[PDB]
Ligand binder design. Sequence first.
Ligand SMILES: [Co+2]
Ligand SMILES: [Co+2]
Lengths: 204, 202
Amino acid sequence: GLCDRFRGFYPVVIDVETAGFNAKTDALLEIAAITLKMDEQGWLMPDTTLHFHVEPFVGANLQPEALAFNGIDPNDPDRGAVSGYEALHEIFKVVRKGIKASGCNRAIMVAHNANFDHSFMMAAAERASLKRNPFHPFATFDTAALAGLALGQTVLSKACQTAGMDFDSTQAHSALYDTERTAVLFCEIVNRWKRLGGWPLSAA
Amino acid sequence: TGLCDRFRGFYPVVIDVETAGFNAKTDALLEIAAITLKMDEQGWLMPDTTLHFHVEPFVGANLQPEALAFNGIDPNDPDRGAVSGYEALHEIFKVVRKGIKASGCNRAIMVAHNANFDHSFMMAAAERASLKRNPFHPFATFDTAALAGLALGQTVLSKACQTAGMDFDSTQAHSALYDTERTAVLFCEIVNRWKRLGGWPL
Ligand SMILES: [Co+2]
Ligand SMILES: [Co+2]
C-alpha cells in the first residue's frame, strides 16, 4: 500500500551536509538516505539506510562558517569519503530497485527544509552526469511544513520533541543522525493521521 | 492572534505566480496574487484579504512560448493593466506587514503549491526591485503539494482540490487569482481537517 498511499510516489528520506548555501559552487560533503515501507496494517516505517561521506568535487568552494556549523573536516583521512558519483549512483540504484519492486513510478525526496537538500542533490547529480535520476525534479515532501501542520513546530529538534521523540543536539548536523530523526518524524506524522481517521479518505 | 500561535509566530500568506518560464532569475514574472488568512472564534482558518496584480515583464526578461501558450498570457497586450514588479511587491509587502503587526506574528511565511517555485520567483523580483524589509522568511515555506500529499494523497493542485471535495475549474486555472484562491481554501481545509479530527491542539 506504500505506492497507493501517495499515488505512485516512492518517498525517500534524505539529508545533506554541505560547505555552503550555493548548490552550484559549494561542496557536497555528506548524504544519507532512508527508504520506507508499509507493513500489513498500513503503518509506515524505515526500510533501508544508506550513508556516505562525500569528497569535495574538484575546484569546489568551501565556506568556513558551514564547516563550523556541521563540524566536518574534509581532509579527515578517516572520513572514508567517496566521489559524489559513487555515493549518488548507489543511492539512485537502491531507490530505482525499490520503485519497480513496489509499483511506484517516481521517487520523491522527504527532507527537513527540502528545497535545500533537493537543490544540492540535483546539482551533484548534474555534475556527475548521472543519466538515471529516479527523483522528481521539483516535487518534495518538506517535513518542516508537515511538522508545522501536525505539531505546530518547524524546527527539527523541537518537532521531534513535541512529537514525543528523542533528540540529541550533540549528534545533529550529521547526515546519518539527521536523516534517521527525519524518517521517524515523517512516519510518526503519517501514522498519526491514519490513527485519527484522516486516512483512508474513503473505500480504497 | 490565535493565528500567530498556531504556527509559532509565522504569519501564513498564500501566494501564486504566473511566469514566462521556469527560471526565476531570467524569465519574466507575469502575475502575482496574495491572500492573507484569519482564524475565527472557533479557531477555524479562512481567507482574509485578497490582492492581485498583472506584472509587466522586467527589462531584459526572457519569454518561453510554451509557457505563454499554457497560461495564455500575452505580455504585449495593449491593456493588460500590468504594473511593474516593484509596484506589485511593494503593495503586497505593505499589506502583509500590516497583518503581521495587527495579529502579533513576527515573520510571514509563503503558502503556495510547489512553494519553492513561487518563492524563488518572488525573491528574484524583490531583489530586482531593490525592495528591503521583505516580511517573508527567506527559506521556510508551507508547500501545499506536500501537505496535500499527507492529508489527501494528492500532490497535483487540481486533483488535491477535487479529492478534498472542492470545485476546480480548468477554464479559470493558471490565473494567479483563481489558483491562489483555490490554494488558500485547500490550505485552510487541510489545517481545519487536522483540527477537526482531533490532531490539534496537542
Ligand atoms: Co559532488
Ligand atoms: Co519583475
